[PDB]
């Protein structure tokens, strides 16, 4: 029975239950709504999107990646919340394919709606989809190719993959140069899998071509007054002390005086203690000093008299990457000047770019940190460029970890679709119908990928289907003229692990969402 047509509604105010078909209608309609809201960023012609803040903040951002929309969007449909959860999972896994897995899930749900309207049970659909996913995964691994051993081929595949990632973004104008720059940046880590080490800056104005890579480090903390402005070839030490009005941590201590003479004596004692601490710091043999918290007037005056620069407002990430790139060691007790390693740098300077004073590091010792200069007229294009660069770094790291790759741009999509169609016509029953709907969603993904360019779909899809039937498993759609051809020679390749992860995530999300039959609601607040 259903509570929709019942003598009583056992609910509080605002809580309701709806008929099974209506419940799935609402859930899957919310899911497909979020799906086509994230849609239209597929392919190299993906249109950008503004991430506006409805509140008084009014923070306006633009991005071509749909995951940014997913992380910052209001949630109404519970299935939409499930979709954003799985998409965030995929994004934390790999930096590309998040919008791909989201749109695949949205389609799978909309043809699930259509197929249930076609009088098919959800369990049969789930079984057919599981069979089709197994077939698609086996086909994808059959055509998967790894070329990590060959260093020249590995570098060429890195070129292709970074170009693939940047094609969907607006940076396609300098795609090749930014590609070689990012590949050099990722190889600068000497096989290190971390990505927070690579740091980026923002500078208003200038052409996009002005963007480049800095091998050293870029710093944007001001220098003191009395200390000399520029001293090179110094030793840099990182400290975790407050370095401001240092007082006894004992809570119960208090001062009880009968006259101002003892007050002045205590003030002089505090000044002498601060001077002793300053001398203890200077005992380390340091000229460029780095601090986290504030530095007051007396210590900065003492540093200026000592001719030693103190750098404040160095946050945890900044000191982290500075230690990674120079080998400096963080310290909190300065009673052992020789027991803490000091940072080694070749050249330090305070460059003047734009209308700001930026400290630039050159000749870093360890080199385990990359600093990238990005130039843009507006902050929006700047953040879009940095997000695209970060996604490129993520996909490059994923390729470095495993070099198993496949031919994308609809090519491997046609492989999967062909395998699933072959199995569907091989098998009888409504499971075949469900998994053929799976296959048609698979085919319609690159359909809209290409149609985002205002091109034709059916002719190219049929041509690629026929060519891959002939055995042209390396044939893929070319965005340059909206035509077909050898996908590899276009220099556009996709990692096999990313494709497999996207396929599995979409399959599992569709399976878990489809099993929902009825929606029950508690009392809203």
């Amino acid at each position: 029975a259903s509570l929709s047509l019942a003598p009583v509604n056992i609910f509080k105010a605002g809580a309701d239950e709806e008929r099974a078909e209506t419940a799935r209608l609402t859930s899957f309609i919310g899911a497909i709504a979020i799906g086509d809201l994230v849609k239209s960023t597929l392919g190299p012609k993906g249109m950008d999107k503004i991430l506006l803040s409805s509140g008084r903040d009014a923070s306006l951002m633009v991005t071509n990646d749909g995951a940014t929309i997913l992380k910052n969007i209001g949630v109404d449909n519970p299935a939409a919340k499930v979709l954003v959860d799985m998409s965030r999972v995929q994004d934390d896994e790999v930096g590309d394919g998040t919008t791909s897995v989201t749109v695949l899930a949205a389609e799978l749900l909309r043809e699930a709606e259509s197929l249930i309207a076609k009088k098919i049970h959800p369990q049969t659909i789930i079984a057919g989809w599981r069979e089709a996913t197994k077939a698609a995964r086996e086909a994808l691994l059959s055509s998967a190719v790894d070329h990590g051993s060959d260093e020249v081929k590995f570098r060429q595949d890195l070129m292709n993959i970074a170009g693939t990632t940047l094609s969907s973004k607006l940076l396609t104008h300098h795609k090749d140069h930014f590609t070689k720059l990012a590949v050099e940046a990722v190889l600068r880590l000497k096989g290190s899998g971390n990505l927070e080490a690579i740091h980026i800056i923002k500078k208003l104005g200038g052409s996009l071509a002005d963007s480049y890579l800095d091998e050293g480090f870029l710093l944007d903390k001001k220098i003191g007054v009395n200390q000399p402005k520029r001293i090179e070839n110094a030793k840099i030490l990182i400290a975790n002390t407050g370095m401001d009005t240092d007082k006894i941590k004992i809570f119960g201590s208090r001062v009880r005086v009968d006259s101002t003479a003892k007050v002045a004596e205590i003030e002089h004692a505090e000044k002498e203690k601060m001077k002793e601490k300053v001398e203890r710091i200077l005992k380390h043999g340091i000229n460029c000093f780095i601090n986290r918290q504030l530095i007051y007037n007396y210590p900065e005056q003492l540093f200026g008299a000592a001719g030693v620069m103190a750098i404040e407002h160095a946050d945890f990430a900044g000191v982290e990457r500075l230690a990674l790139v120079t080998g400096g060691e963080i310290a909190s007790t300065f009673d052992h000047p020789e027991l803490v390693k000091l940072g080694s740098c070749k050249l330090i300077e305070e460059v003047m770019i734009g209308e700001d004073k930026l400290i630039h590091f050159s000749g870093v010792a360890l080199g385990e940190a990359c600093t990238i200069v990005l130039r843009g007229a507006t902050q929006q294009i700047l953040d879009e460029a940095e997000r695209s660069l970060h996604d490129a770094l993520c996909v490059l790291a994923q390729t470095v970890k495993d070099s198993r790759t496949v031919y994308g741009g609809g090519c491997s999509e046609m492989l999967m679709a062909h395998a699933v169609t072959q199995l569907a016509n091989r098998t009888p029953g409504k499971e075949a119908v469900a998994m053929e709907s799976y296959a048609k969603a698979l085919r319609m993904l690159p359909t809209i990928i290409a149609d985002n360019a205002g091109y034709d779909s059916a002719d190219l899809v049929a041509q690629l289907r026929a060519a891959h039937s002939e055995g042209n498993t390396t044939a893929g759609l070319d965005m340059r003229e909206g035509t077909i051809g050898d996908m590899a020679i276009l220099g556009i390749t996709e990692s096999f692990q990313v494709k497999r992860q996207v396929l599995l995530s979409a399959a599992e999300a569709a399976e878990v969402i489809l099993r929902v039959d009825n929606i029950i609601k508690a009392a809203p607040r």
């Binding site: 239209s40 249109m47 506006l52 007054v225 007082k247």
Partner: protein, 468 residues
């Protein structure tokens, strides 16, 4: 006000397009210093061309690459037509400064200001062999009332805060002394309670505080200072009545509420290091003095003019006058625009006559290139040229003149050879404006063109807008 940078940065509409146009104007101001109005007008023209390009059922991605080709062609044309100058050609710098001042209220106050601006630039930066200009070298004193003739080229330091030491004026050969310790009773870092159980103890309290403050004054006079400057302290009283009286009894000028940000500028200029501890009262505080006069502007503002130092830094100051705040801001920003123009003259010494002539030439050349093209690209480049034709229309407008006739006459004069033909505002006609010294550098128009093209491309590939 007139110049559009402040106008855009002041008003706000909250629509993302408006905010990013404001950001584009700010970036244009940052990169070059002027042309913000020009670049935003160019963006608006490209967008009115774009909407018509869009109603024709054209994909908004091929038009982006067409705009990129138009941009690179226009950059090539502008670079080709521009003529280089020399860093020793003061005449070219004077022409550029005068042209910059024309678009401001002080347009007729240019013959005395352009040499002023170039001399200030020469003083505050490297006279030659330099790449960047530090705009922070020169500060501005904005004063109500007065005239442009009342503006000065002071090269010392001015303290806008009031003289808390009333009755002390014109300390001859004044020695400027900056201190950071607050002139008040001593206080420990930790909380103290002054418990008093006897009359003698309470008397000793203030007796000892008076003795300590007198010792402080004596140690201040140990070096022989006659002018004292205190920081801006709000937790503790920077200047107390007892300290002020003790310093006035023996003639030291006292001024409090001094910002900590100006301390770095003072150190860069003269080098009087701030002092936080009394024991470090060395002899490096002071130096030679030339002039310290408390000038008054007919009672319409109190100022402390202290000019003249021995071996100062490369920093000067400007005192901008004006009846109302708007004209003061206009004169100040006119001076700033002149300085930015000289900065643009520092690098990429490529000059071209302005006044619509570069835009007329660009429109004609892009029309030719569109004719040479084919496909949607030719139509997009035609729309591009029609859009960029707007600037000579606006310049021909604001005077009631015919834009069509002006544009066609300029195009014909370019065709016969006279490319440098512009709009002559003084003669109210159309002729070459090279004689009128209406010349602009390369990296102002080039920067505006590139920025406008990038912004229109950014907003070109937009599908929908959503809120969070």
């Amino acid at each position: 006000t007139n110049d559009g940078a402040t106008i855009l940065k002041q008003m706000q509409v909250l629509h993302p397009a408006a905010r990013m146009l404001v950001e584009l104007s700010k970036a244009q101001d940052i990169e070059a210093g002027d042309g913000t109005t020009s670049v935003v007008i160019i963006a608006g023209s490209l967008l009115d061309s774009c909407t018509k390009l869009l109603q024709k059922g054209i994909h908004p991605t091929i038009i982006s690459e067409s705009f990129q080709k138009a941009l690179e062609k226009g950059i090539e044309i502008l670079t080709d037509m521009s003529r280089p100058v020399e860093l020793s050609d003061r005449e070219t710098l004077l022409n550029s400064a005068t042209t910059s001042l024309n678009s401001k209220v002080v347009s007729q106050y240019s013959s005395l200001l352009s040499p002023m601006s170039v001399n200030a630039v020469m003083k505050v930066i490297d006279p030659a062999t330099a790449t960047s200009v530090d705009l922070r070298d020169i500060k501005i004193v904005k004063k109500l009332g007065g005239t442009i003739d009342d503006c000065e080229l002071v090269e010392g330091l001015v303290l806008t805060q009031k003289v808390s030491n009333s009755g002390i004026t014109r300390v001859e050969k004044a020695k400027i002394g900056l201190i950071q310790f607050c002139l008040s009773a001593p206080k420990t870092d930790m909380d103290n309670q002054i418990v008093v159980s006897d009359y003698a103890q309470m008397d000793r309290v203030l007796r000892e505080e008076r003795a300590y403050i007198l010792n402080l004054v004596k140690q201040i006079k140990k070096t022989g200072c006659n002018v004292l400057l205190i920081q801006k302290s709000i937790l503790r009283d920077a200047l107390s009545d007892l300290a002020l009286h003790f310093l006035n009894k023996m003639k030291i000028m006292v001024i409090k509420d001094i910002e900590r940000e100006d301390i770095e500028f003072i150190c860069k200029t003269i080098g009087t290091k701030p002092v936080a501890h009394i024991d470090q009262f060395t002899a490096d505080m002071l130096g030679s003095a030339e002039l310290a006069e408390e000038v008054n502007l007919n009672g319409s503002g109190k100022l402390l003019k202290i000019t003249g130092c021995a071996s100062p830094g490369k920093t000067v100051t400007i005192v901008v006058r004006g009846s109302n705040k708007l004209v003061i801001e206009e004169a100040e920003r006119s001076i700033h625009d002149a300085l930015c123009v000289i900065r643009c003259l520092v690098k990429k010494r490529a000059l071209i006559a302005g006044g619509g002539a570069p835009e007329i030439e660009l429109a004609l050349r892009l029309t030719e290139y569109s004719r040479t093209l084919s496909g949607m690209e030719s139509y997009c480049v035609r729309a591009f040229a029609d859009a960029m034709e707007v600037i000579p229309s606006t310049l021909a407008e604001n005077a009631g003149l015919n834009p069509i006739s002006t544009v066609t006459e300029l195009r014909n004069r370019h065709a016969q050879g006279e490319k440098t033909a512009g709009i002559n505002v003084r003669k109210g006609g159309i002729s070459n404006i090279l004689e009128e010294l209406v010349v602009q550098p390369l990296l102002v128009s080039v920067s505006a063109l590139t920025l406008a093209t990038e912004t229109v491309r950014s907003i070109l590939k937009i599908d929908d807008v959503v809120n969070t």
